[PDB]
């Protein structure tokens, strides 16, 4: 993915290019006259006498000082942006690499499992490993099961039906199991819950005793 | 901006180097960033989702946040409220956004439809349908409350929700300054441009702020002296403007980054971060579009009517 | 072709829609399809969810995905000799430059602060492990 | 550019040192998880 895409790392290349441009601009400004007879200071000094040379020199000083001040101001603004990026990278290291995050889309798309750091020129690369659900199927569901006049709810899952039989499964991966007293809990009668359906709830100790 | 249509000024301006190029580059960079900021916040959905023809969500009424098809704008009742509440001759131009207001509204609709029909699943992978009442049950578990509490109080909860939403329009509409946060941004930008224009009236030591009058009255060796004074002043004014825009842009970028984070963590999931997605225990949130900004509606659970009990760490 | 951004000449307008390649403005983008074309950008494919009050979709399989994220951490550290940049080796200029006060000192200080920060930025990101494992 | 009074300063940490930090983080994660 990286090797076949020369521009994949543009985010880091852009930083390098911006810094290089700023320096090249600062140097090229030395060629400007700024109203002086010449941008070359030595030529002014060699041709003109003091009371006249100083007038020409002040023009170059003003221009060059202004150019240098502009450069520094831009560097301060750019530095602030880089600091913000570094602060984010440091946070991701702590939360994505040194632990497992529950923050959505913080450590890549999907459900975060783990991440690995890699070094780079003036930057860092994170490899985010995530879990993605696949191949979903349609099931019929219900909020509760009614049995012996009592309402039963899932302890850690959802009630589903394959069209003929009811099962209870974990939510993020289809794995149907028989509905029993060990995977449900009871609260109130069947007259309150809207959408409650009739089904048997198996008690493992019934056939034993 | 500096020289107008004067070739005399234009030639003099060449002696200052590449300042004009640098200024144009800085403003161009800002303009591009503004489109990036919008995309990062709104374009977080892979596909355009739609709601059912029949709005049956178990008593939960979303009609004030969903698009109103009877209008050409296809905006919600709340969005309509938000939108209603909130120089070229000098070389100053205003560029259009890449995304139109309609496109932003469409992104918002997709996010709402996704949340309502598939909860948070569409934010991680494929959108998986679930009954809304059951989605709410899972969000109750996420705050340490058993699911049977929802099912036994479904009518009460749906009513409390519906009323809380209805109050939003009254809270906003009855308070003209409610959206000041967005109005302040608009006002600051307008002031900056007005200042830049008014500075053209300054003499800066010249006999006149009007360049044509100088050229019409004075001969070259004298006119150039007066012109250089105007160039220095106007160039300094323009440089000041750009610097201030760079600083302001940084503040906006920070805000956009926060909005993008809230979209991911408050809208596309359920947050456990305290006071990140409103006060109380977070259940869910809904996005609404706004002029140069976004509005989040945070739905939270708040405990009420506590009673005193005697307790113990253990039973023997 | 007339658009809100201005007048576009040389591009072939089409009534199709694609992902935005080269942005023009006001919902209009252009791409090379050969000739250059202009079109209204698409926001993505349409997907209707089969919602009902008793139907749920549950995954039966899964995949493992690995993606990359790239962040800048630091800049190149630089330093400028203010007097040399402005005056070179001229003592005439150097003396004149003294009349402007402490500007050169202020500029050097600002750049020095930036240079130091760049090392702090690196340490904050990478030096988060107490021992070398 | 040095001749114009412009200088480039070296980083405190070398590329090798940064690589070593990265290796320690990877080794830690693989053998001991988040502990
Ligand atoms: C579920 O059924 C609907 C029709 O009611 C169908 O459009 C959809 O594709 C089915 N989903 C799956 C995963 O089979
Ligand atoms: C539902 O599952 C049960 C138990 O595995 C099976 O006997 C029954 O045939 C299934 N029903 C359908 C329609 O597949
Ligand atoms: C589900 O919708 C059907 C109509 O399509 C209705 O008859 C049934 O009572 C509803 N079930 C619940 C729990 O609302
Ligand atoms: C569920 O079982 C109860 C008790 O036998 C019965 O009264 C009720 O009508 C049943 N519900 C349905 C839909 O058959
Ligand atoms: C939803 O609320 C609106 C505004 O009060 C109302 O006009 C509409 O009839 C309600 N929808 C339902 C199904 O009650
Ligand atoms: C609990 O009892 C205290 C007195 O001991 C009283 O001040 C307080 O209001 C009571 N709290 C509630 C919720 O009744
Ligand atoms: C696009 O559609 C318009 C009608 O709305 C038609 O006049 C125009 O010729 C079409 N252009 C192309 C390339 O199909
Ligand atoms: C799950 O998907 C993998 C491919 O990613 C496939 O090899 C495997 O057989 C699938 N399992 C089932 C039960 O379909």
From Swiss-Prot, chain C:
Main component of the anti-COVID vaccine Chadox1/AZD1222/AstraZeneca; in which the human tPA leader sequence is added in N-terminus to enhance protein secretion. Contains sequence and structural motifs very similar to those of a bacterial superantigen and can directly bind and activate T-cell receptors. Activation of a broad T-cell repertoire may be involved in the hyperinflammatory syndrome in acute COVID disease. The KxHxx motif seems to function as an ER retrieval and binds COPI in vitro. Disulfide bonds join 20-29, 82-104, 87-93. Changing residue 11 to V: In strain: 19B/501Y. The gene is S. Variant D614G has become the most prevalent circulating sequence in the global pandemic since April 2020. The mutation is associated with higher viral loads produced in cell culture and animal models. It would not change pathogenicity nor neutralization properties vs vaccination. May be prevalent because the mutation increases virus transmission in human population. Changing residue 45 to V: In strain: Beta/B.1.351, Iota/B.1.526. The chain holds residues 643 to 789 of 1273 of the full protein. This is Spike glycoprotein. It is found in: Virion membrane; Host endoplasmic reticulum-Golgi intermediate compartment membrane; Host cell membrane. The cytoplasmic Cys-rich domain is palmitoylated. Palmitoylated spike proteins drive the formation of localized ordered cholesterol and sphingo-lipid-rich lipid nanodomains in the early Golgi, where viral budding occurs. Belongs to the betacoronaviruses spike protein family. Glycans are attached at residues 15, 53, 61.
């Amino acid at each position: 993915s990286l090797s076949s895409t020369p521009s994949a790392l543009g985010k880091l290349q852009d930083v390098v290019n911006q810094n290089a441009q700023a320096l090249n601009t600062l140097v090229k400004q030395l060629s400007s006259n700024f109203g002086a007879i010449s941008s070359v200071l030595n030529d002014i000094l060699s041709r003109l006498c003091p009371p006249e040379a100083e007038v020409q020199i002040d023009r170059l000083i003003t221009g060059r000082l202004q150019s240098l001040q502009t450069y520094v101001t831009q560097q301060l603004i750019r530095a602030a942006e880089i600091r913000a990026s570094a602060n984010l990278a440091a946070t991701k290291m702590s939360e994505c690499v040194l632990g497992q995050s529950k923050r959505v889309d913080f450590c890549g798309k999907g459900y975060h499992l783990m991440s690995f750091p890699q070094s780079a020129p003036h930057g860092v690369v994170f490899l985010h490993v995530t879990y993605v659900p696949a191949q979903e199927k349609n099931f019929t569901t219900a909020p509760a099961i009614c049995h012996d006049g009592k309402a039963h709810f899932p302890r850690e899952g959802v009630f589903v039906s394959n069209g003929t039989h009811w099962f209870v499964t974990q939510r993020n991966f289809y794995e149907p199991q028989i509905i029993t007293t060990d995977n449900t809990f009871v609260s109130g009668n069947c007259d309150v819950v809207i959408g409650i359906v009739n089904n048997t709830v198996y008690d493992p100790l019934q056939p034993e005793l | 901006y500096i020289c107008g249509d004067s070739t005399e000024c234009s030639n003099l301006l060449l002696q200052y180097g590449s300042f004009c190029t640098q200024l144009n580059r800085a403003l161009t960079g800002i303009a591009v960033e503004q489109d990036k900021n919008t995309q990062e916040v709104f374009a977080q959905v892979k596909q355009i989702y739609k709601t059912p023809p029949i709005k049956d969500f178990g008593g939960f009424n979303f009609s004030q946040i969903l698009p109103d098809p009877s209008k050409p704008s296809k905006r919600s009742p709340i969005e309509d409220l938000l939108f209603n509440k909130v120089q070229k001759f000098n070389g100053l131009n205003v560029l259009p956004p890449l995304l139109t207001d309609e496109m932003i509204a469409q992104y918002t609709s997709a996010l709402l439809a996704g949340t309502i029909t598939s909860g948070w699943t569409f934010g991680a992978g494929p959108a998986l349908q679930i009954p809304f009442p059951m989605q709410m049950a899972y969000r109750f578990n996420g705050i340490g409350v058993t699911q049977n509490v929802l099912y036994e109080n479904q009518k009460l909860i749906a009513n409390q929700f519906n009323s809380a939403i209805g109050k939003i329009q009254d809270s906003l509409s009855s308070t003209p300054s409610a959206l000041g946060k967005l109005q302040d941004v608009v006002n600051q930008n307008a002031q900056a441009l007005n200042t830049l224009v008014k500075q053209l009236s300054s003499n800066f030591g010249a006999i006149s702020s009007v360049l044509n009058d100088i050229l019409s009255r004075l001969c070259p060796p004298e006119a150039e002296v007066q012109i250089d004074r105007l160039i220095t002043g106007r160039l300094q004014s323009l440089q000041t403007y750009v610097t201030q825009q760079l600083i302001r842009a940084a503040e906006i970028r920070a805000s956009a980054n926060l909005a993008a984070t809230k979209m991911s963590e408050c809208v596309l999931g359920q947050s456990k971060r305290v006071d990140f997605c409103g006060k109380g225990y977070h259940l869910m949130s809904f996005p609404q579009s706004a002029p140069h900004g976004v509005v989040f509606l945070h739905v939270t659970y708040v405990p009420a009517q506590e009673k005193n009990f005697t307790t113990a760490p253990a039973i023997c | 072709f007339q658009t809100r951004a201005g007048c576009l000449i040389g591009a072939e307008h089409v009534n199709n829609s694609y992902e935005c390649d080269i942005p023009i403005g006001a919902g209009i983008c252009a791409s090379y399809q050969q000739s250059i074309i202009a079109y209204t950008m698409s926001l993505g494919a349409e997907n209707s969810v089969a919602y009902s009050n008793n139907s749920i979709a549950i995954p039966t399989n899964f995949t493992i995905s690995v993606t990359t994220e790239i962040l800048p951490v630091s800049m190149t550290k630089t330093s400028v000799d203010c007097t040399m940049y402005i005056c070179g080796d001229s003592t005439e200029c150097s003396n004149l430059l003294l009349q402007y006060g402490s500007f050169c000192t202020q500029l050097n200080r600002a750049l020095t602060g930036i240079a130091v920060e760049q090392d702090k930025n690196t340490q904050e990101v990478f030096a988060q492990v107490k021992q070398i494992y």
